[PDB]
Paper text:
We purified recombinant human paraplegin including residues 305–565 (corresponding to the ATPase domain) in the absence of excess nucleotide. We determined the crystal structure of this protein to a resolution of 2.2 Å. The protein crystallized with one monomer in the asymmetric unit, and ADP was bound in the nucleotide binding site. The structure shows the typical AAA+ domain consisting of a five-stranded parallel β-sheet flanked by two α-helices on each side, together with a carboxy-terminal bundle of four antiparallel α-helices. The nucleotide binding pocket is located at the interface between the β-sheet and the α-helical bundle. Despite high concentrations of ATP and Mg2+ during crystallization, ADP was clearly seen in the electron density, and as in previously determined FtsH structures, density for a magnesium ion was not observed. The conserved P-loop in the Walker A motif (GxxGxGK(T/S); residues Gly 350 – Thr 356), is central in binding the β–phosphate of ADP through hydrogen bonding interactions with the backbone nitrogens of residues 352 – 356, the Lys 355 and Thr 356 side chains, and a water molecule. The adenine base is stacked between the hydrophobic side chains of Leu 357 and Ile 448, and hydrogen bonds with the His 492 side chain, the backbone amide and oxygen of Ala 312, and two water molecules. The pore loop of the paraplegin AAA-domain contains the sequence Ile 382 – Gly 384 (IGG), and alignment of our structure with the FtsH hexamer show that the Ile 382 side chains of paraplegin line the central pore in a similar fashion as the Phe 229 side chains of FtsH. Most of the known disease mutations in the SPG7 gene lead to premature termination or map to the metallopeptidase domain. Some mutations, however, have been identified in the AAA+ domain, and surprisingly, they all map to the C-terminal α-helical bundle.
Paraplegin is an m-AAA protease of the mitochondrial inner membrane that is linked to hereditary spastic paraplegias. Human paraplegin (SPG7) is a mitochondrial membrane-associated AAA-domain containing metalloprotease consisting of three homology domains: The N-terminal FtsH-extracellular domain, which is found in membrane-bound ATP-dependent proteases; the intermediate AAA-domain; and the C-terminal metallopeptidase M41 domain. The protein is believed to form a hexamer that uses ATPase-driven conformational changes in its AAA-domain to deliver substrate peptides to its protease domain. Paraplegin is implicated in the degradation of proteins that come out misfolded after transport across the mitochondrial membranes, and in cleavage of mitochondrial targeting sequences.
Residue numbers in the entry: 304 to 332, 339 to 410, 430 to 531, 540 to 559
Write the structure that this text describes.
């Protein structure tokens, strides 16, 4: 079994917001959801959440990187977009995930505009770039909504530390330490937090706190 909501720490408002897509994918049959933009800084769980939504609905997850688009080879991106959406229709219900953002873009707009009631695909698109909100993916009949996912708050950081201390079998006193690790890590992303824990795992079922603390102060300069 894959990434689920259990593996996604914090992000409580965003979980409430992708619920409608979980519900739709679980039984197509209100307005028909097409999908959503996940917006925010890197390493903050956009991809993890999109994977979790597929797992929760129990459907396939089909991904395309925004960097299979940028027109370097003529026609190639359009052709990959078409294959993607044809596989998605055949494997439906399912999630199509476009990670991290115009023949290739126009083809995507065509696939989306061409999505009717019968298709049962949800498109989740992620980006670090806010001005994507102003463009063609957010026009009527395309991506329905966006969800802003920011750097984790103190409490969210507590939860992310706890999740990763437990994934790495360092559960003993993980909750004792999580509070201070959170206080020490303003402006850290979930990825930064995962890297601290793993670096400390790479140095029995309890965190080496004094080392974790060292890596937090190192990473505070440059992560
Ligand atoms: N909310 C979170 N809960 C648990 N781990 C997280 C969270 N956010 C980030 N991470 C960790 O950071 C990794 C990279 O994040 P990713 O999903 O690539 O984020 P993004 O798509 O926003 O740039 C995740 O696979 C996970 O290990």
């Amino acid at each position: 079994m894959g990434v689920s909501f259990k593996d996604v720490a914090g992000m409580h408002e965003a979980k409430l917001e992708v619920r409608e897509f979980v519900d739709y994918l679980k039984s197509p049959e209100a307005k028909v959801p097409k999908g959503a933009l996940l917006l925010g800084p890197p390493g903050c769980g956009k991809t993890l959440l999109a994977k979790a939504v597929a797992t929760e609905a129990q459907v396939p997850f089909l991904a395309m990187a925004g960097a299979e688009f940028v027109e370097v080879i003529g026609g190639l991106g359009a052709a990959r977009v078409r294959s993607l959406f044809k596989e998605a229709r055949a494997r439906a219900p399912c999630i199509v995930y476009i990670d991290e953002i115009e023949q290739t873009l126009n083809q995507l707009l065509v696939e989306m505009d061409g999505m009717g009631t019968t298709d049962h695909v949800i498109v989740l698109a992620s980006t670090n770039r806010a001005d994507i909100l102003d463009g063609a993916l957010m026009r009527p009949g395309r991506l329905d909504r966006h969800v802003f996912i920011d750097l984790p708050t103190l409490q969210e950081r507590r939860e992310i530390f706890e999740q990763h201390l437990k994934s790495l079998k360092l559960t003993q006193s993980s909750t004792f330490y999580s509070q201070r690790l959170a206080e020490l890590t303003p402006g850290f992303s979930g990825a930064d937090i995962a890297n601290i824990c793993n670096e400390a795992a790479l140095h029995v079922h309890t965190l080496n706190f004094e080392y974790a603390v060292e890596r937090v102060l190192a990473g505070t300069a440059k992560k």
